[model samples]
Target: MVKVTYDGVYVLSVKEDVPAAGILHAGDLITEIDGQSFKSSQEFIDYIHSKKVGDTVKIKYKHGNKNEEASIKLTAIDKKGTPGIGITLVDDLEHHHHHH
Candidate 1:
């Protein structure tokens, strides 16, 4: 999960022992994914949820002063069969968290 702000989706943390951990960094702001801008966290999550496991997603993120892009391979959230990347978004009064 991520923290949504006016700037974009901020990477709070990534699960260890996962492909995302190697590629995504905490505090990075996700500007775009697959060349699409996200106005809401759910929009990004929905797009990712639409994809199957093993699918690769093209992501653009800002790390500090630099911006980087990468192709991340999707994986199940857990062995219980939850699809997509594993993450937990923390909610705050400034940001609302929603998942379906």
Candidate 2:
């Protein structure tokens, strides 16, 4: 097996009562949406933002060296009606490492 790195969302926090609350948490890195990985954070954000409220998206993530999956439902991330996975994250934008 080979290790792959890419631009991803490093989860900082998760909102309660959402699909992300338990399945994901702080210090998690989301690497892919649906079945495909992305090259930039904007692509990842835009894809999720384009969905409807009831949309369910499968996310691929990493937790403690273990790859995992979470299927999240899009809903209000803001006070007003918005479509999102209801989590706070920073742009991982590729892992910063020296060696290959």
Candidate 3:
């Protein structure tokens, strides 16, 4: 296996209950991801390396006192040379959470 690094230059902290089709909108702090815990955005990217394009991943995150799960599919190129789910993330880091 090989290790890969991705630049999570953009990230957003959203309020719990925001509805994202393939992402979990939970908690003020990131607690769990795909049932795994992360220390930072980079840590989450490191987790992404464990999977490959076209793979389906289920993410479980904490939101307040509740846990939420979301299913997402991985893609390559994404029509913009980056991994995207055909959804344009809001540019404001404070307003919306986006990771590249």
Candidate 4:
């Protein structure tokens, strides 16, 4: 799951055996998915849902001051077995509250 903050979608946890397990790290801020920019947590999640398992997706993200990109294969959610990138998003209201 990612923590959605004002900065972007921050990687919260990556399940082992998932495509992004090694390529994405906790705290990385996801800026784009499949080469497209996303403005909301649901936008990102819906994009992933649009793809099937075994599909490859290009992701652009930021870690610290560095920008990184990767092509990841989609997989099924561990418990639900639903097709997904094995990631989730959590609204970081605490961080959002600061901007007000």
Candidate 5:
């Protein structure tokens, strides 16, 4: 797990055996998923327990002052599974270009 922070945006840290995919972001503050409010990161995990290896997930998030949500499907865990939350290890704080 990593402690992430960003300027002009809200940051969220997520750790899981499965990697994330579409509609996920590192600097995103996840407020809800499938209409459930997750007060903490663990709560979010608890909610995901109902899901299986291949299931679609709907997530609600807040970036800065704006709120948004999206639907994404989960895939079977892969070796060296990539972190799908849109961000890279080498994040550009100045130019805002994250490694892909």
Candidate 6:
């Protein structure tokens, strides 16, 4: 199993056909965004909400124990009618590690 140890945005799901599609996935650990780390999901949500649609944001995350980054353009969340990275995520403060 992939070993991930960090606290940030834990990707719950990635929207299909969105900017993050084919890139990020569920279980990826987002350590920071644009070099800034979030202590809570609200902070992460606010940072993404502040950007407009089509705005590209750099994401640094942990995938399979390898740290990486990518620029994802913001897309409509549809529910709130707000621009987002097309994902439903939460802070990693809730848990540590994963199933083997």
Q: How far is each candidate from the true structure, as Cα RMSD in Å?
A: 6.1, 7.1, 9.6, 7.7, 10.7, 7.9
Error of 1 at 38 (Å): 5.9
| Local accuracy of candidate 2 as per-residue lDDT tens digits, 1-100 | 7887665666767777776777888887777787653466566777777677887888788887888886867877777667886776675548857698
TM-score of each: 0.72, 0.72, 0.44, 0.70, 0.50, 0.71
| Candidate 1 lDDT, 3-60, residue by residue in tens | 6654576666777867777777677777778865445665787778767887788877
Clashes of each: 2, 0, 2, 0, 0, 0
Q: How many angstroms is residue 14 displaced in model 3 relative to the true structure, after the best TM-score fit?
A: 8.5
lDDT of 4 by residue, 11-100 (tens): 667767666777887767887777554467667777777777777788778778888888866777766655666665668647555456
lDDT of 6 by residue, 22-83 (tens): 88888887777776545565676777877777777887777887878888667787787687
Model 1 alpha-carbon miss at residue 22, Å: 2.3
User: The CA-based lDDT of model 2 is what?
Assistant: 0.73
* Model 4: residues with Cα > 4 Å off, grouped in runs: 1-6, 78-81, 93-100
> What 10-residue stretch in candidate 3 is worst by lDDT?
83-92
lDDT of 5 by residue, 27-96 (tens): 6666667776445554555555556655677877775678777766565433634213333322235865
Better of 1 and 2 by lDDT: 2
Supply the TM-score for candidate 5.
0.50
Better of 1 and 5 by TM-score: 1
Which prediction has more favorable TM-score, 3 or 5?
Answer: 5
Please state the error at residue 74 of candidate 5 in Å. Answer: 1.2
Residue 75 in candidate 3 has what lDDT?
68
* Residue-level lDDT for 22 in candidate 1: 74
